[PDB]
Amino acid sequence: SNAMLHYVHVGNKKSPNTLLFVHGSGCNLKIFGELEKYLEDYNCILLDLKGHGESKGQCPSTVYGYIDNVANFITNSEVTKHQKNITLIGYSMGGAIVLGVALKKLPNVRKVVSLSGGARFDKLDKDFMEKIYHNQLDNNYLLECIGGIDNPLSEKYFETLEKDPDIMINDLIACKLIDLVDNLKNIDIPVKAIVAKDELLTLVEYSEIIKKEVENSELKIFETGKHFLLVVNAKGVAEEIKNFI
Numbered sequence: 217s218n219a220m221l222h223y224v225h226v227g228n229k230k231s232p233n234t235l236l237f238v239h240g241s242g243c244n245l246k247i248f249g250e251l252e253k254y255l256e257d258y259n260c261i262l263l264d265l266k267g268h269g270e271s272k273g274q275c276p277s278t279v280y281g282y283i284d285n286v287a288n289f290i291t292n293s294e295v296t297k298h299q300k301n302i303t304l305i306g307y308s309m310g311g312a313i314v315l316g317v318a319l320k321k322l323p324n325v326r327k328v329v330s331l332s333g334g335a336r337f338d339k340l341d342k343d344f345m346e347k348i349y350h351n352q353l354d355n356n357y358l359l360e361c362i363g364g365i366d367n368p369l370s371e372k373y374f375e376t377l378e379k380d381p382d383i384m385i386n387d388l389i390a391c392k393l394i395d396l397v398d399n400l401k402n403i404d405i406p407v408k409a410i411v412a413k414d415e416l417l418t419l420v421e422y423s424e425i426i427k428k429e430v431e432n433s434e435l436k437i438f439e440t441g442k443h444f445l446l447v448v449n450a451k452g453v454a455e456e457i458k459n460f461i
């Protein structure tokens with residue numbers, strides 16, 4: 217036995233291109249269920265962060281904790297330690313995490329994608345975050361952020377979110393605390409940000425800052441999709457990963 221994070225391994229396991237997926241606040245690797253369908257030609261590794269999905273333990277309270285956990289996995293897991301061309305794909309809080317991992321300068325991490333993410337989340341809705349600080353999760357606002365559950369894919373994937381609300385609360389507080397912006401200039405590898413213009417949660421402006429600050433960077437703005445862009449337009453998001461890796 218070992219203390220490695222739980223992961224799922226799918227796709228073309230012999231591909232020279234390894235994609236390591238890192239999920240976001242209050243969810244788990246299940247959130248990538250649609251996106252993984254369009255990336256089958258790659259060696260896909262989907263991680264559960266500590267305390268999420270099948271990875272046991274207390275959820276770290278800071279993005280720095282998650283960054284250290286993910287770096288430990290990359291360096292030490294049998295599934296990544298020998299892989300020479302890793303692209304990190306981080307969604308939501310995972311976007312900040314993969315930017316933080318890029319700053320660790322791991323020899324085998326070659327590119328990063330921040331999907332509906334950011335390096336700082338300073339404009340999170342004040343009333344929503346006040347509730348979070350009072351240990352209350354506004355499901356109406358969460359649904360608004362993902363664009364509702366009328367799309368059957370959205371209904372399905374919304375149900376994959378963690379059932380204990382303490383996890384979402386922990387993760388949103390971690391997001392309100394993180395600020396990697398003034399370190400983005402130190403990232404040596406290519407970074408691509410992908411986001412929907414109609415975001416209420418991970419605003420397009422957060423992705424514009426990533427593009428501005430990282431020297432070798434790309435930005436794709438979809439007109440619509442809100443925070444469930446990776447579910448309702450998984451095919452389009454996958455195309456915008458393929459054109460970058």
Ligand SMILES: Cc1ccccc1C
Nearest residue numbers: 240241243308309358
């Ligand atoms: C990752 C995730 C899932 C559902 C709502 C908000 C967020 C940040």
